[PDB]
């Protein structure tokens, strides 16, 4: 596959995908750091809804793509997202969801033609 064919296959799939953007910050940050991440998350929500034409879901368990406020390895064991992630990793036959950090999501969206 070429990058052009890769982009078209993603776009066709994104029309049939539900995306969840989580509330939980994995670690202690300042008010300034949290505001910077939140502003980036809000821009990503708009790109997925308006440009990629995905459905925004409020339930991370009813989503194909999960956008995180950090890396999955950074979330505590007691965290609901971390528990669900661990439960999915153990089941080979389970329905697969992607867990993307907000940095990985920014790079993906830029590779789709929406540079942010």
């Amino acid at each position: 596959l070429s990058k052009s064919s890769w982009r078209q296959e993603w776009l066709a799939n994104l029309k049939l995908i539900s995306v969840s953007l989580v509330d939980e910050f994995p670690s202690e940050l300042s008010d300034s750091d949290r505001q910077i991440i939140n502003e980036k998350m809000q821009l990503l929500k708009d790109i997925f809804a308006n440009n990629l034409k995905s459905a925004i879901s409020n339930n991370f368990r009813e989503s194909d793509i999960i956008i995180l406020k950090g890396e999955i390895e950074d979330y505590p064991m007691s965290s609901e997202i971390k528990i669900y992630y661990n439960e999915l990793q153990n089941k080979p036959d389970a329905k697969k969801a992607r867990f993307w950090s907000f940095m990985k999501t920014q790079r993906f969206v830029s590779n789709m033609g929406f540079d942010i």
Binding site: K3, W6, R7, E9, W10, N13, K96, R98, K104, N111
Partner: peptide, 10 residues
Amino acid sequence: LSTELSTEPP
């Protein structure tokens, strides 16, 4: 969603 499509381009 299927695991075959990569997040990173070819």
